[PDB]
Amino acid sequence: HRFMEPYLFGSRLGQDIIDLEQTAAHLQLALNFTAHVAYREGIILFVSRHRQFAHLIETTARDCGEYAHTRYFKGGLLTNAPLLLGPGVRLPDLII
Amino acid sequence: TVDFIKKQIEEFNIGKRHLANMMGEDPETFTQEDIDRAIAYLFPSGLFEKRARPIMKHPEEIFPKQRAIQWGEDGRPFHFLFYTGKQSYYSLMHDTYGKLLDVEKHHNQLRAKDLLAEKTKILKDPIGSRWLIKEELEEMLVEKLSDQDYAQFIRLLERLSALPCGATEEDFVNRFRRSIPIQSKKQLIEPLQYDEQGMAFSRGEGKRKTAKAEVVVYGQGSGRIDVNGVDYLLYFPVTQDREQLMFPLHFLDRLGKHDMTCAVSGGGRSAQAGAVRLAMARALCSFVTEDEVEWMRQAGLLTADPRVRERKKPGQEGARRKFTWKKR
Amino acid sequence: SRYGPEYKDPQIDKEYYRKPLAEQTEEEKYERDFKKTQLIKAAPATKTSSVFEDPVISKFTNMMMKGGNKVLARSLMTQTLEAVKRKQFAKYHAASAEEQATIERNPYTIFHQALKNCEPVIGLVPILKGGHFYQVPVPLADRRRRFLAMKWMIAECREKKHRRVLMPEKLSQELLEAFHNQGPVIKRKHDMHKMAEANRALAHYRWW
Amino acid sequence: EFRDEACRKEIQDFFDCASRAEAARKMRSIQENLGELGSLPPKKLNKLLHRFPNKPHV
RNA sequence: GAACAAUAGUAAGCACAAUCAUAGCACAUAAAAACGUUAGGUCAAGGUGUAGCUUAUGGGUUGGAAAGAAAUGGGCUACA
RNA sequence: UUCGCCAGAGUACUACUCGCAACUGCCUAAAACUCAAAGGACUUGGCGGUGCUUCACAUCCACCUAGAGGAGCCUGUUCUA
Ligand SMILES: [K+]
Ligand SMILES: [K+]
Ligand SMILES: [K+]
Ligand SMILES: [Mg+2]
Ligand SMILES: [Mg+2]
Ligand SMILES: [Mg+2]
Ligand SMILES: [Mg+2]
Ligand SMILES: [Mg+2]
Ligand SMILES: [Mg+2]
Ligand SMILES: [Mg+2]
Ligand SMILES: [Mg+2]
Ligand SMILES: [Mg+2]
Ligand SMILES: [Mg+2]
Ligand SMILES: [Mg+2]
Ligand SMILES: [Mg+2]
Ligand SMILES: [Mg+2]
Ligand SMILES: [Mg+2]
Ligand SMILES: [Mg+2]
Ligand SMILES: [Mg+2]
Ligand SMILES: [Mg+2]
Ligand SMILES: [Mg+2]
Ligand SMILES: [Mg+2]
Ligand SMILES: [Mg+2]
Ligand SMILES: [Mg+2]
Ligand SMILES: [Mg+2]
Ligand SMILES: [Mg+2]
Ligand SMILES: [Mg+2]
Numbered sequence A: 001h002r003f004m005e006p007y008l009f010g011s012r013l014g015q016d017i018i019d020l021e022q023t024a025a026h027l028q029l030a031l032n033f034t035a036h037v038a039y040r041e042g043i044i045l046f047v048s049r050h051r052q053f054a055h056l057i058e059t060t061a062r063d064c065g066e067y068a069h070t071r072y073f074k075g076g077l078l079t080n081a082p083l084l085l086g087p088g089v090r091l092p093d094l095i096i
Numbered sequence B: 001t002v003d004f005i006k007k008q009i010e011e012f013n014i015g016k017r018h019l020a021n022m023m024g025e026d027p028e029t030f031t032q033e034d035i036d037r038a039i040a041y042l043f044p045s046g047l048f049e050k051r052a053r054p055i056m057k058h059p060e061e062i063f064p065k066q067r068a069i070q071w072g073e074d075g076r077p078f079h080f081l082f083y084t085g086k087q088s089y090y091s092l093m094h095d096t097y098g099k100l101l102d103v104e105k106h107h108n109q110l111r112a113k114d115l116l117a118e119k120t121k122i123l124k125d126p127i128g129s130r131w132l133i134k135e136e137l138e139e140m141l142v143e144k145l146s147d148q149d150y151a152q153f154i155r156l157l158e159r160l161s162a163l164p165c166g167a168t169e170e171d172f173v174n175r176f177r178r179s180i181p182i183q184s185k186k187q188l189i190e191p192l193q194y195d196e197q198g199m200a201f202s203r204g205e206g207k208r209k210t211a212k213a214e215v216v217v218y219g220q221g222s223g224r225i226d227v228n229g230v231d232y233l234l235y236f237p238v239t240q241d242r243e244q245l246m247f248p249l250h251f252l253d254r255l256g257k258h259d260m261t262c263a264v265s266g267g268g269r270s271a272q273a274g275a276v277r278l279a280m281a282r283a284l285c286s287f288v289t290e291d292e293v294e295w296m297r298q299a300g301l302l303t304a305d306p307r308v309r310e311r312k313k314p315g316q317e318g319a320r321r322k323f324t325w326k327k328r
Numbered sequence C: 001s002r003y004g005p006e007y008k009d010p011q012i013d014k015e016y017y018r019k020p021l022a023e024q025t026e027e028e029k030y031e032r033d034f035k036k037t038q039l040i041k042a043a044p045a046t047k048t049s050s051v052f053e054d055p056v057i058s059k060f061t062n063m064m065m066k067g068g069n070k071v072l073a074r075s076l077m078t079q080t081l082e083a084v085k086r087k088q089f090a091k092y093h094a095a096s097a098e099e100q101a102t103i104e105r106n107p108y109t110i111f112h113q114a115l116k117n118c119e120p121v122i123g124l125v126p127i128l129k130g131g132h133f134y135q136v137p138v139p140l141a142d143r144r145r146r147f148l149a150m151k152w153m154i155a156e157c158r159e160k161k162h163r164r165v166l167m168p169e170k171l172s173q174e175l176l177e178a179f180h181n182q183g184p185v186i187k188r189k190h191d192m193h194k195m196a197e198a199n200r201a202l203a204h205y206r207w208w
Numbered sequence D: 001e002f003r004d005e006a007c008r009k010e011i012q013d014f015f016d017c018a019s020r021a022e023a024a025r026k027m028r029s030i031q032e033n034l035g036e037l038g039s040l041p042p043k044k045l046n047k048l049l050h051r052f053p054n055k056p057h058v
Numbered sequence E: 001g002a003a004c005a006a007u008a009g010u011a012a013g014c015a016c017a018a019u020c021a022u023a024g025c026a027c028a029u030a031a032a033a034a035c036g037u038u039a040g041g042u043c044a045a046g047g048u049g050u051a052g053c054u055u056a057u058g059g060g061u062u063g064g065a066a067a068g069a070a071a072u073g074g075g076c077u078a079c080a
Numbered sequence F: 001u002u003c004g005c006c007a008g009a010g011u012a013c014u015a016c017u018c019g020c021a022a023c024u025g026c027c028u029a030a031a032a033c034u035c036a037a038a039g040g041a042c043u044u045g046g047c048g049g050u051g052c053u054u055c056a057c058a059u060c061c062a063c064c065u066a067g068a069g070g071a072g073c074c075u076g077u078u079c080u081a
Helices: A020-039 A054-064 B002-023 B032-042 B087-113 B134-138 B147-162 B167-174 B239-252 B269-283 B290-298 C025-035 C055-064 C070-093 C107-117 C142-159 C167-179 C184-198 D008-025 D028-038 D042-051
Strands: A008-012 A015-018 A044-047 A067-069 B129-131 B177-179 B193-195 B198-207 B212-218 B224-227 B259-265 C123-129 C132-138
Touching (some): A044 A054, A054 A067, B087 B147, B087 B167, B147 B167, B239 B290, B239 C070, B259 B269, C055 C070, C055 C107, C070 C167, C142 C167, C167 C184
Antiparallel strands (some): A008 A015, B212 B259
């Protein structure tokens, strides 16, 4: 993809290699940001539409006590929340 | 609507006490069947719709099952799949898939230890087991489903049931099992009756095309049939009609081994002939072994003829024929 | 139709049930007939397990019926078989030694053989192409050929017979005529073959 | 002279061909749908292509 | 505004469906068939908008609406 | 950077004019008058004697039975009166 050029260390025989030095910098902030929103009693949702880790991700959220959605994503879920879920619904404060 | 259900529960118990008080029975055993027969008496509603009659039952059975509150005062959903839209169905899918992996993991360990102590218990044919219907499943998860979702869930159970079965899994699977009623097409053989030194006489009932036939057959007489006090040959001049009476007896090779008297009313010559034929077939089942009774059914003797004359529609010459349709 | 899709046609032949132990595959067929608990229709009024009936007679008897007089149609079919029998019996008496054991005195044998000679081998169906109709020959199915022979028999003896001559005797004459391959019905069968052979180059029009 | 007294051999083959053509015509449609001649039916290929669609945009 | 190995749709209302009737079920037949279309038919079932009549387009009495050159539609009885 | 072309539609690849081995020709190219629109692309619907696939169980063809149109009579319209 065109926007991933800065994050690529290089290409090895047609195979792109991701620069882990930039990954470590980003992952450090991502984990730090994830913990703080969990510290403040925030709702965290795990979203992953991939049919090889759906069970693993679903079990991962159960252990952490947080929510997961690895199934088919309905159209009006996050936007038209009152109709899909219920009258008064608290939207998730972070999505992974 | 938790409180509204609670209010209905307490007043129904109070209402039941009043009904028992006026009916003059024991309130400790005022069962629901007694309630229905009491209500049907006090309020005699003549209506063809069975669901439109007055009812007074357990409010849990009357009111549809309701969803519980899904979040606390702070808004956090109780279940961990609430944001998938269908928490109940997907939690069932997650648990079902987890059991398969545990069975696969357990079976993998057993193969490592070289032990196969499980057996396939999927075959429940003698009990007559069928899977849950989509409507029944929706009333178990208290959530609406779709045809694609139901088919996927059932197929997953088949994969779970096709693997080696553990004790915990079988209890989980059997909750989704339903038993069909007894299926059989054998008829009830009427026992022979003896009356006033009379031996081996049976009675049969037949009806076809507005014609009822009453046939009693004696197994101790020669070959003769007495219909309405007259000989059958005089009563059935048509050769075809007398062929109908032959058909049951000739099939069993007992043309001359039975003496019969019949009483048939209503209908034409063929309607009565068919009715008497049907009555003999049912009345002769007593004297014949069970195996040939099945042969009787396969030949169509024992099955009533459902073909009856239709009505005349308003605006048509006959039952199906319409008036001439002039296009222009 | 008051019968649902589950109901099936009953089996009437008694001999099919009395000797099942001489075969295995057929045993599996009828043991599953009731083991599947399949419903069975009521026995039709016309067909019966009497050994003196014949399926080709019942179909021919039904077509002779006009309106709803099954008694009259059966009466006519009874006399016609009698009339054929009387004529063959008389001819047997007035014959030489070699001619005696040639004449057939079985009306059922005559009736079955007569219709098998009146059946056309190849029919015609109009086909529309280019704004015109071309008579294209087709290999008519066995059921159509059998039905077509019966209709020709009834059509001939109803139209071009005299008013005085009765129906049972007129039909009896044509059965003997068809038994010897010289009746007008046989002539009509050949006429249909004449047209089919004439249009033998138009068979390419049909697409089946 | 249009008489089948000596055409029995030809007449039977014509009946045999009619039955032979009837049998093949009344069975080709059902089996050809799933026979596939080694190549998946159109319904299966449509689902396979939907899983790996083409991307004209972006 | 749909892709189920799912790609923006959601839950209710009416109709279909199910149910009810034709005294068992089943099948079949009845019954049902929304929103609209044809300024479709009905001021002469009755009511009524607008326009018209008021010793008259209102009310009553007596007598009378014949007739088929011909053309056609749907039927009964036939031509045995 | 530079040249050519474009000022509503119809009248108009026309009338008149200049040049041309063209002479029913080509190039150049108006106005009187009429209208308040002409025109480009798209959306839904209807339709198609457009193509592909599938289907009509009284049904379009193939095909089954009984009838109408022919005559008298009964009754209903049009016309005649
Ligand atoms: K008015
Ligand atoms: K369109
Ligand atoms: K008529
Ligand atoms: Mg009728
Ligand atoms: Mg519905
Ligand atoms: Mg009912
Ligand atoms: Mg029904
Ligand atoms: Mg109706
Ligand atoms: Mg309905
Ligand atoms: Mg109008
Ligand atoms: Mg009209
Ligand atoms: Mg009008
Ligand atoms: Mg009025
Ligand atoms: Mg008027
Ligand atoms: Mg008014
Ligand atoms: Mg007046
Ligand atoms: Mg006329
Ligand atoms: Mg009419
Ligand atoms: Mg008469
Ligand atoms: Mg401009
Ligand atoms: Mg201009
Ligand atoms: Mg030009
Ligand atoms: Mg010019
Ligand atoms: Mg028709
Ligand atoms: Mg008639
Ligand atoms: Mg006429
Ligand atoms: Mg008339």
